[PDB]
Amino acid sequence: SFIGSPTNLIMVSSIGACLFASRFGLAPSVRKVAQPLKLSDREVLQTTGDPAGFTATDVLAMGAAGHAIGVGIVLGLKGIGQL
Amino acid sequence: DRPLWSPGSEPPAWLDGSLAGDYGFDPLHLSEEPEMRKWMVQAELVHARWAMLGVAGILFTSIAAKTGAPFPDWYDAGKEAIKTSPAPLGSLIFTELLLFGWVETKRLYDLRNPGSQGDGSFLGITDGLKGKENGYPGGLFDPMGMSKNEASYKEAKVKEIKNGRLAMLAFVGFIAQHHATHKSPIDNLLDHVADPFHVTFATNGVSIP
Amino acid sequence: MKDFTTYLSTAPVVGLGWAIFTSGLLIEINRFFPDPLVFSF
Amino acid sequence: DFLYVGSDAAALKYLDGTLPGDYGFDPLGLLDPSVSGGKGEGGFVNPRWLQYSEVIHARWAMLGAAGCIAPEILGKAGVIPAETAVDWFRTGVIPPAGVYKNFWADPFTLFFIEVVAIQFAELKRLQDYKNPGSQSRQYFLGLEGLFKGSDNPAYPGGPFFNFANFGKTEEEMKKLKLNEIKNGRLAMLAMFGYGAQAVITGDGPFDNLLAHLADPTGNNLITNLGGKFG
Amino acid sequence: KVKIAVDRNPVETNFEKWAKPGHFSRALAKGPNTTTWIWNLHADAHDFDNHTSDLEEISRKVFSAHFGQLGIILIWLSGMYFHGARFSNYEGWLSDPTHIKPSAQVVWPIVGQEILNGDVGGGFQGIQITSGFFQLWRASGITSELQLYSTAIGGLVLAAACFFAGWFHYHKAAPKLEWFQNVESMLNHHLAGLLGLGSLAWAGHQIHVSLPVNKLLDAGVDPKEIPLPHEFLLNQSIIADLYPSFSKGLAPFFTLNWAEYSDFLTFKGGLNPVTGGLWLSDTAHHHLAIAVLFLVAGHQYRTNWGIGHSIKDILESHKGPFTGNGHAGLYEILTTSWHAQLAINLALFGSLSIIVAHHMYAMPPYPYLATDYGTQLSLFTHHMWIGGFCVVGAGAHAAIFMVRDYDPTNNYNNLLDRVIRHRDAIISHLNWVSIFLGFHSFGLYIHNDTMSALGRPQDMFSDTAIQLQPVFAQWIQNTHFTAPQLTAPNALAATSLTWGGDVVAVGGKVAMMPIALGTSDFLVHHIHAFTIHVTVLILLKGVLFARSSRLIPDKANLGFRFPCDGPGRGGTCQVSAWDHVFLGLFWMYNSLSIVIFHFSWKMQSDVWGTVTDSGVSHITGGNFAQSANTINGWLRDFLWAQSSQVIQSYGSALSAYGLMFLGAHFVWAFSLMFLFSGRGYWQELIESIVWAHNKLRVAPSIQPRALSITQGRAVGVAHYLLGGIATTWSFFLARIIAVG
Ligand code: CLA
Ligand code: CLA
Ligand code: CLA
Ligand code: CLA
Numbered sequence A: 001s002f003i004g005s006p007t008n009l010i011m012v013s014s015i016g017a018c019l020f021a022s023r024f025g026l027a028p029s030v031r032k033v034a035q036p037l038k039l040s041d042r043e044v045l046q047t048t049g050d051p052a053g054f055t056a057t058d059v060l061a062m063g064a065a066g067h068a069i070g071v072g073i074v075l076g077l078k079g080i081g082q083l
Numbered sequence B: 001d002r003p004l005w006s007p008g009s010e011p012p013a014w015l016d017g018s019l020a021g022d023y024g025f026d027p028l029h030l031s032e033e034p035e036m037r038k039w040m041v042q043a044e045l046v047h048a049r050w051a052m053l054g055v056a057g058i059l060f061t062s063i064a065a066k067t068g069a070p071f072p073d074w075y076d077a078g079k080e081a082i083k084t085s086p087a088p089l090g091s092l093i094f095t096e097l098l099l100f101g102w103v104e105t106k107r108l109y110d111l112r113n114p115g116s117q118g119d120g121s122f123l124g125i126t127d128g129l130k131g132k133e134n135g136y137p138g139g140l141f142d143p144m145g146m147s148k149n150e151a152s153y154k155e156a157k158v159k160e161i162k163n164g165r166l167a168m169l170a171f172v173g174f175i176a177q178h179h180a181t182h183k184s185p186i187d188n189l190l191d192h193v194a195d196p197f198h199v200t201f202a203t204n205g206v207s208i209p
Numbered sequence C: 001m002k003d004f005t006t007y008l009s010t011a012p013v014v015g016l017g018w019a020i021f022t023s024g025l026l027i028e029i030n031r032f033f034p035d036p037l038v039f040s041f
Numbered sequence D: 001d002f003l004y005v006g007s008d009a010a011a012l013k014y015l016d017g018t019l020p021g022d023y024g025f026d027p028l029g030l031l032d033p034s035v036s037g038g039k040g041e042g043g044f045v046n047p048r049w050l051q052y053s054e055v056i057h058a059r060w061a062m063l064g065a066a067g068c069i070a071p072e073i074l075g076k077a078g079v080i081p082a083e084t085a086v087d088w089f090r091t092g093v094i095p096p097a098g099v100y101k102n103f104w105a106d107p108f109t110l111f112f113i114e115v116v117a118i119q120f121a122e123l124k125r126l127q128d129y130k131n132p133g134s135q136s137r138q139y140f141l142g143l144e145g146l147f148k149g150s151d152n153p154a155y156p157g158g159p160f161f162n163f164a165n166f167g168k169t170e171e172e173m174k175k176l177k178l179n180e181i182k183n184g185r186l187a188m189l190a191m192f193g194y195g196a197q198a199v200i201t202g203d204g205p206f207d208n209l210l211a212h213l214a215d216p217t218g219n220n221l222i223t224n225l226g227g228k229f230g
Numbered sequence E: 001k002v003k004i005a006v007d008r009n010p011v012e013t014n015f016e017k018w019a020k021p022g023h024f025s026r027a028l029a030k031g032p033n034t035t036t037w038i039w040n041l042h043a044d045a046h047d048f049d050n051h052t053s054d055l056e057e058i059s060r061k062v063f064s065a066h067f068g069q070l071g072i073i074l075i076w077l078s079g080m081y082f083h084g085a086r087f088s089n090y091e092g093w094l095s096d097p098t099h100i101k102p103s104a105q106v107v108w109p110i111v112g113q114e115i116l117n118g119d120v121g122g123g124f125q126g127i128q129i130t131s132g133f134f135q136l137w138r139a140s141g142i143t144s145e146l147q148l149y150s151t152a153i154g155g156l157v158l159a160a161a162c163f164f165a166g167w168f169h170y171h172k173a174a175p176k177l178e179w180f181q182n183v184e185s186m187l188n189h190h191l192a193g194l195l196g197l198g199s200l201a202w203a204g205h206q207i208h209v210s211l212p213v214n215k216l217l218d219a220g221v222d223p224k225e226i227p228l229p230h231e232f233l234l235n236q237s238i239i240a241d242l243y244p245s246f247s248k249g250l251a252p253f254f255t256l257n258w259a260e261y262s263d264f265l266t267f268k269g270g271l272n273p274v275t276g277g278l279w280l281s282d283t284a285h286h287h288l289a290i291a292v293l294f295l296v297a298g299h300q301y302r303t304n305w306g307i308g309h310s311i312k313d314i315l316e317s318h319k320g321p322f323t324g325n326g327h328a329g330l331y332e333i334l335t336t337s338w339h340a341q342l343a344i345n346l347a348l349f350g351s352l353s354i355i356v357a358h359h360m361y362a363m364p365p366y367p368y369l370a371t372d373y374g375t376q377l378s379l380f381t382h383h384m385w386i387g388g389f390c391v392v393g394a395g396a397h398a399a400i401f402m403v404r405d406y407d408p409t410n411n412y413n414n415l416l417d418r419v420i421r422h423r424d425a426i427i428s429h430l431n432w433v434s435i436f437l438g439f440h441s442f443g444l445y446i447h448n449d450t451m452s453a454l455g456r457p458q459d460m461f462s463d464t465a466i467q468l469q470p471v472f473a474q475w476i477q478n479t480h481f482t483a484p485q486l487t488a489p490n491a492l493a494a495t496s497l498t499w500g501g502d503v504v505a506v507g508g509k510v511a512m513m514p515i516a517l518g519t520s521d522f523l524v525h526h527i528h529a530f531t532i533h534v535t536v537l538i539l540l541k542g543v544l545f546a547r548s549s550r551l552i553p554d555k556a557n558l559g560f561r562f563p564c565d566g567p568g569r570g571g572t573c574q575v576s577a578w579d580h581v582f583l584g585l586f587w588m589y590n591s592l593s594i595v596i597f598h599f600s601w602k603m604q605s606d607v608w609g610t611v612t613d614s615g616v617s618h619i620t621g622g623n624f625a626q627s628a629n630t631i632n633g634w635l636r637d638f639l640w641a642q643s644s645q646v647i648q649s650y651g652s653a654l655s656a657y658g659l660m661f662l663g664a665h666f667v668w669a670f671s672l673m674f675l676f677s678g679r680g681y682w683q684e685l686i687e688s689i690v691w692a693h694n695k696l697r698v699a700p701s702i703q704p705r706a707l708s709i710t711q712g713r714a715v716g717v718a719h720y721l722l723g724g725i726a727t728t729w730s731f732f733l734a735r736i737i738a739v740g
């Protein structure tokens, strides 16, 4: 996880893609309950600052999912011999 | 209205403070029934008196041993006593068992029926050998004592029960720090006074692994 | 004490007290004395 | 200003400017009056006992955070001798970490003294919590007058617990309450830190502060997690 | 939404209800007029449904009941640890596991019991144990008896804490019904919390404690100079030499360089040749991966923070056209019925215990466990029987839910209602496959017996004669043997030596060797399939016909456990679902007895034995491929070729196994009174005895009555099962101790 490593780049890009995905619809966040196609835009608790629904549990889950996706990508690329 | 065993606690309903040393300490609800209350009072009194007698004898023997007189330790005193005793083992314990059985069923049937032995059945004595209170007899057992005065008798009762409880604590301390140190209680006391900052219950090896 | 000793007096505890007493009595007889066959004093 | 990052809804509905804390940070929810409803003492999950344990944990954390770092800078300076100046976990609290041999008594002797004294203290505290003001009625060495306490068992006051007795006005008392609970919540993280720093470096917390100060990039979380002893 | 709803002090803590034994039931609250009052008292003692109709009090009752059972199990575990600490040869067994038999029970010299203190070696005498606790205490790194004493005292402390917790959570602070109905929070907390936290804690304990101790143990180092695990925990220098990846010090974990941890988180197939058990590095990576899988699965459901899954939505959304309403109401049933959840949990627990027994006999996870044949056989048989009991109880409590907690209002066209609708088709098809499996397994056995008896072995169903080769099982064996070659290239060897090509051996005895499957294994496996199909037929028929039937339409109003509806319709005896479970217990007993007979014979004839320089010699003569095809071969070469040590056990260390064998014969035979007979004859005999006691005035105030018909059936099945279980236990243990 040295600054400049391909694993660091993969981790940061995954985290940023997950925050982008949860910022404007586009992900089953605390604001967006999920149907088979993830609709209906509900509201609970409060966002505490920036708009939409980035609560304390929204960034906690998306960071967890973004981290967990990154272990799959890095170790998958490491197993096949990439980066 | 009374100093309890724990400040702010709720005293038991069966402990109204009318007993000697009634500090209201009874979490297991023993002595709730009045007959068993009397039996517990009797048992506490006799265990207390025997604890004080044994502790006083142990302390006297240990002090006499420390001053230079030939005396055994409080432990295994009888083991080295029997080899020089004219009375052998077996006969001594059985003699004391018969005599103490006589005295103890006499006081037992005095406890069951107060004043039952004051009818002159035992050698024609009426005022003597008659229980004055629950665990407190009279006649022969109060030769010169001040139990006639009520306040002095109550103060002596409180003093007796408190000294008894202190002697129970002393006897358990005796066996505990004898198993800890294998020395006389006076020797342990002198070691505690000589080096209080180091010699204690913690630096004896045993009981603190 | 009365409320607890009423439970203490019911049959399962009596099913223990007699059992403990008789069992321990027979253990001590078979322990201090060896295994005999004849009651020839 | 108000509320916090977690700040669950249906949790601010039972607290608004009442407790000395009350910053709206109850994401899980444990001060609901519906919890432990009924009769009797019941359980520990209730606002009174939770506030009581929070302020007690707070003050104990203040004392601990003062005592853990106090010998250290004074050992760096010439205040206390460096022979006695040792890390807080090497004083005998963790004998695997180390003990101080040059004490006036055995560590278990001091443990028994602490056990007796603080058993008296905490059992009197618990008995006054069960029965408010009941320690001022049973005779205790002639000092029953300073154990009267107040309506809140957490904040007793009296001739000794508040011998300075300043903050008589409600506003100054509320400010002192907020200051106490905020410095206690800081000492919370101070102890959490001090323990984590001790387990991740094996050295004292002020030495870790010096390490972060001299080299922030080379001595931080990422380098110390990948180092020796953690 | 999810919160902690708790009612404080609902029940006073007093012995008032202890004074009167009959207080939970209003029928038993009057008095003991008849002797059946006592059996109803001990029978309806924990039946909380008829004590009260409130679900909240039932939930509190079962919560503190589970607390009490947990405290009891913790007391038992603490007692086992104390026995291993005080009366054991664990110190001797650590220095010599291949020559010193384990022993942890010491008898008294009171009456002739000194012969039971067998010469197990190491200068120690006692009962040779079979639970395998020494293997567990060698896996989890334990050296001295001080550590076992500490574990026992901690277990006693936690047991007292659990009992105090039950008392508190019932009498002092009882949770409400909404607290128990938080199913999503329950599942998340018992997936991520319980299972995941325990798996991660065990992985950490194995990595920081068990791995260095087991690395030094199999290297020939005596345990006396082995460093204590706290030295490995605190000091990285001592743990660095045994495992070089610890010199990195948690750097590869956060930097995603987990390939550097390949020294103590290995992925190896097979067993450790020094000890015979699984590699502790493999178990460490296993429990770490299990902790990962349970941490990720424990964050699936939605409790309070919007995100997650709602189980009602998941159930109601899976609807498929041949099922009508698909899982429409099952969330409402499982959140309101304790017996339905009891059936599900007991069925899955029993099946998982069966998997546990099979996967310990397959891959021994403990050092010096494969060579200890007694511990392996005892573990397999014991978890086999416990799994069977849990499955039978699952069927019983499913039938109880069917009788009591099932209502037709919530379910109209769902899966449960449609299973009720076509129950006759299910029972008929199960009967057909039952008859089919029974014929072409047991008739094959009888035909082989006949052709052996008729002097025509070439007409038998054997390997020498025409054979039924189990091609599917052998192909699965070959695939798993070649699985590390292609499909799992990172595995060092095969996951087990069931299908391998090498033989491991510790101390001159075979630890685990490849297993060959022939016609006899085919016959026994299809016998097992037949027997399990019959038992599941009995249990499923009892569950399905508990509510209503073509015979008795009003069986729902007659309760779950009733003896009969009278001699009408030709006699409706044993028509209740309780009697279906009563028969299913015996069918379970037959199934698991034949299963463990197959296990013992196959493992003694083709796996267990002593390795020599000239080949491998097993315990028997390898006669399973020649004698397991006939009933007489099975009898003579398993029950008569063995059990020669049980009969001659007298005067030796294992004579108590012979005594237990004959007492088990007694109890098994004594049960057939309560099974064949009825009640009217016994009631009339009791009337005559009552007259005898009336003649000389010793008449009890309580009227002596014969046992109830359900009571008599329960006594019969209990005595029968206890006798059979103890018979097989004594025979198996004596055979595996005197030989293995
Ligand atoms: C010192 C403790 C102590 C106290 C305060 C009491 C007090 C009482 N007892 Mg009791 N008693 C005691 C010990 C004590 N007893 C012992 C040990 C026994 C067993 C032998 C008894 C046996 C006994 C009986 C059988 C009866 C009483 C009765 C009484 C009452 C009479 C009042 C009286 O005369 O005062 C007593 C005053 C004293 C005992 C103080 C004298 C203490 C001396 C000076 C100590 C020195 C002697 C010692 C052996 C030396 C120790 C040496 C050491 C330093 C090495 C009163 C409540 C009677 C009663 O209640 O009737 C209504 C009654 O019937 N007691
Ligand atoms: C992550 C949190 C957590 C954990 C670890 C557990 C753990 C457990 N629960 Mg569960 N439970 C939880 C949250 C949790 N619970 C929640 C949130 C609810 C409400 C929805 C419940 C409601 C619930 C019910 C209704 C029942 C359980 C039961 C059990 C026990 C099952 C016995 C077993 O499988 O053997 C494992 C055995 C052990 C590990 C033995 C050690 C037990 C230790 C002492 C428990 C420590 C865990 C605990 C959560 C710590 C905090 C408690 C604190 C106040 C002291 C097990 C100990 C059953 C029970 O009564 O047992 C208590 C049961 O019937 N649970
Ligand atoms: C789940 C069980 C578990 C546990 C308990 C540990 C624990 C430990 N491991 Mg291990 N580890 C585990 C699993 C586990 N590991 C697994 C699964 C792997 C993967 C293979 C590893 C891989 C691994 C490596 C490679 C290394 C460790 C190391 C360590 C140590 C460093 C801990 C650390 O960095 O935190 C730092 C400490 C803290 C964060 C402290 C926690 C906070 C404290 C408790 C707060 C308390 C303060 C309180 C307020 C006041 C205290 C009371 C006071 C008044 C007396 C520690 C002993 C390293 C080592 O040996 O170092 C010694 C090391 O090199 N481990
Ligand atoms: C070993 C003892 C034994 C045996 C063999 C049977 C046999 C039977 N029971 Mg029973 N059972 C027994 C004890 C036994 N019972 C006991 C003690 C209980 C009480 C718990 C039960 C409880 C019980 C229940 C609850 C159920 C059964 C059922 C069955 C049937 C299963 C048929 C099947 O699939 O197998 C195939 C057939 C056989 C094994 C019979 C022998 C066949 C041999 C090999 C002869 C083959 C053909 C032959 C050549 C024809 C001869 C011709 C001749 C007339 C000239 C069968 C009639 C079930 C049923 O009705 O069927 C689904 C059922 O539901 N039984």
Ligand code: SF4
Pocket: E563, E564, E565, E566, E567, E568, E571, E572, E573, E574, E678, E709
């Ligand atoms: S024999 Fe018994 S079970 Fe059968 S119908 Fe008669 S009374 Fe009922």
